[PDB]
Paper text:
The crystal structures of the N-terminal tandem Tudor domains of FXR1 and FXR2 were determined at 2.50 Å and 1.92 Å, respectively, and revealed a conserved architecture as compared with the same region of FMRP. Superposition of the FXR1 and FXR2 tandem Tudor domains structures yields excellent alignment with a 1.0 Å r.m.s.d. The N-terminal Tudor domain (Tud1) spans residues 2 to 49 of FXR1 and residues 13 to 56 of the FXR2 protein. The Tudor domains tilt toward one another to generate an interdomain angle of approximately 110°. Interaction between Tud1 and Tud2 creates an interface of 257.5 Å2 for FXR1 and 258.9 Å2 for FXR2. The orientation is stabilized in FXR1 by an ionic lock formed by inter-domain salt bridges between E6 and R47 from Tud1 and E65 and R112 from Tud 2. The corresponding residues for FXR2 are E17 and R58 from Tud1 and E76 and R123 from Tud2. Furthermore, FXR2 shows some degree of preference for H4K20me3 peptide. NMR titration experiments carried out for FXR2 resulted in similar shifting with only 1.5-fold molar excess of H4K20me3 peptide suggesting a specific interaction of higher affinity than for the methylated lysine alone.
FMRP, Fragile X Mental Retardation Protein, and its autosomal paralogues, FXR1 and FXR2 (Fragile X mental Retardation Syndrome-related Protein 1 and 2, respectively), comprise a family of RNA-binding proteins. The N-terminal region of FMRP, and the FXR1 and FXR2 paralogues, contains a nuclear localization signal between residues 1 and 184. In this work, we present the crystal structures of the NLS of the FXR1 and FXR2 paralogues and definitively classify this region as a member of the Royal Family comprising a tandem Tudor repeat. Extensive structural and biochemical analyses also suggest that this region recognizes tri-methylated protein substrates in a sequence-specific manner common to both paralogues.
Numbering used by the authors: 10 to 64, 69 to 82, 86 to 110, 115 to 132
The structure:
């Protein structure tokens, strides 16, 4: 009851984090719906779950980028260069030019 609809982020097999919402909480996992799929419940172990970030990007900063390699997920990256509103980033999983809507500081929340 208490955790109904809690937003969480879930580690995919690709290392990226995907948004889901809690339905039930068990001793060792949660039942969730992934974002844009309210029909299929999915069970995720706590070691694959973190809370989403609490509610300034400069060159060199570690960031996360919202990308597909699939649904979009948050991927770990670094800002190699910025000029105006263009950001040049490199993925920790592997350059891409993105705008600021695609970026956030690294979620400070650890896996549960």
């Amino acid at each position: 009851a208490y955790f109904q609809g809690l937003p969480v982020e879930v580690r995919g097999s690709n290392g990226a984090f995907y948004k889901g919402f809690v339905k039930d909480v068990h001793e060792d996992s949660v039942t969730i719906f992934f974002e844009n799929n309210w029909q299929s419940e999915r069970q995720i172990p706590f070691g694959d779950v973190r809370l989403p970030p609490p509610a300034e990007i400069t060159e060199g900063d570690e960031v996360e980028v919202y990308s597909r390699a699939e649904p979009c997920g948050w991927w770990l990256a670094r800002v190699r260069m910025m000029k105006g509103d263009f950001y040049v980033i490199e993925y920790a999983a592997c350059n891409e030019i993105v705008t600021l809507e695609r970026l956030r500081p690294v979620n400070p929340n650890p896996l549960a």
